[PDB]
UniProtKB/Swiss-Prot annotation, chain A:
Subunit structure: Present as a mixture of monomers and dimers. The phosphorylated receptor binds a number of SH2 domain-containing proteins such as JAK2, STAT3, PTPN11, and SOCS3. Interaction with SOCS3 inhibits JAK/STAT signaling and MAPK cascade.
Residues bearing attached sugar chains per UniProt: N17, N46, N55, N86, N108
Official protein name in the record: Leptin receptor
Post-translational note: On ligand binding, phosphorylated on two conserved C-terminal tyrosine residues (isoform B only) by JAK2.
From Swiss-Prot, chain B:
GN (gene name): LEPR
Protein's name in the database: Leptin receptor
Residue ranges of every copy of the Fibronectin type-III domain listed in the record: 1-83
Glycosylation site list: N4
Domain of life from the UniProt record: Eukaryota
Tissue specificity of this protein: Isoform A is expressed in fetal liver and in hematopoietic tissues and choroid plexus. In adults highest expression in heart, liver, small intestine, prostate and ovary. Low level in lung and kidney. Isoform B is highly expressed in hypothalamus, but also in skeletal muscle. Detected in fundic and antral epithelial cells of the gastric mucosa. Isoform B and isoform A are expressed by NK cells (at protein level).
Species the sequence originates in: Homo sapiens (Human)
Self-association state and partner proteins as the record states: Present as a mixture of monomers and dimers. The phosphorylated receptor binds a number of SH2 domain-containing proteins such as JAK2, STAT3, PTPN11, and SOCS3. Interaction with SOCS3 inhibits JAK/STAT signaling and MAPK cascade.
Family (UniProt): Belongs to the type I cytokine receptor family. Type 2 subfamily.
Span of the entire protein shown here: 747 to 829 of 1165
Length: 187, 83
């Protein structure tokens, strides 16, 4: 699976609610069928266990402490997956910004232009998240994972000219997720 | 200058000379990416051209108008920045 973290809370509060969302596996990716999914959490106590999420697409947790790591193992009847995606949460690196600017323009109803300019940083940079949402209705969040090597990508999605949309870019580092950049419209 | 995302209008001016000119070739090339060179034909009777194609307004595009006389190609003319 490819999980995605949703946060619904104030930045001032030290405890944040994190929701995990993943796109259902396809026939080839899961090698066919996976009967049940499991999510494991990493704790400073180093407790090894398993938590069963079910076929439900939503899972919620409350993050308070420093070092937390989540791994979504897709256990099949044969066994468990060997390679999984990875993400970290912590405070100090959530303020550093490496991307100063970005712009978004509409081509038509099928594609959107996004460009960004960033600056070199001491830590290694590998990949980025770009997602979009609608303010007219509080629907589901649509997101995509892109590489940091290429500075230019066209979003292929439906877009209503009348409705006003929100775009945002999340940076990813080994230490965690940095300061998110959210764009409203032309300014 | 681009009228919108799908139309660009170019303008020029000519002066009398001993040689005569027959047609013009409109050529453009991108800066950041090394894309294929696109060229178009135009006669000298009409002074305006409405280039219609898919364009991305954000990036700069380099334009070039070249003249033709009895002896062939003349001095290249380069347009680097949008007006
Ligand atoms: C997170 O997972 C990736 C790949 O699954 C791995 O390369 C990396 O070392 C992991 N990080 C930690 C802190 O376990
Ligand atoms: C929108 O533009 C894209 C190219 O950016 C093109 O593939 C698509 O066909 C266009 N939409 C329509 C409805 O023609
Ligand atoms: C741009 O202008 C040209 C010339 O009138 C027109 O054909 C075209 O429909 C216009 N494009 C848009 C997106 O309005
Ligand atoms: C092409 O050939 C014709 C006849 O040989 C000549 O009149 C014409 O000038 C030539 N074209 C050019 C560009 O010289």
């Amino acid at each position: 699976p490819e999980f995605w973290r949703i946060i619904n809370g104030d930045t001032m509060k030290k405890e944040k609610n994190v929701t995990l969302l993943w796109k259902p596996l396809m026939k080839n990716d899961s090698l066919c069928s996976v009967q049940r999914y499991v999510i494991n959490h990493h704790t400073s106590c180093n407790g090894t266990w398993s938590e069963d999420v079910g076929n439900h697409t939503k899972f919620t947790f409350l993050w308070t402490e420093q070092a937390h790591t989540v791994t979504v193992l897709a256990i099949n009847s044969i066994g468990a997956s060997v390679a999984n995606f990875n993400l970290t949460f912590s405070w100090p690196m959530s303020k550093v910004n490496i991307v100063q600017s970005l712009s978004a323009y509409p081509l038509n109803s099928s594609c959107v232009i996004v460009s960004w300019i960033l600056s070199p940083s001491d830590y290694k940079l590998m990949y980025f998240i770009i997602e979009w949402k609608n303010l007219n209705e509080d629907g589901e969040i649509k997101w995509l994972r892109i590489s940091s090597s290429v500075k230019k990508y066209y979003i292929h999605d439906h877009f209503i000219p009348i409705e006003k949309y929100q775009f945002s870019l999340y940076p990813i580092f080994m230490e965690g997720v940095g300061k998110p950049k959210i764009i409203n419209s032309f300014t």
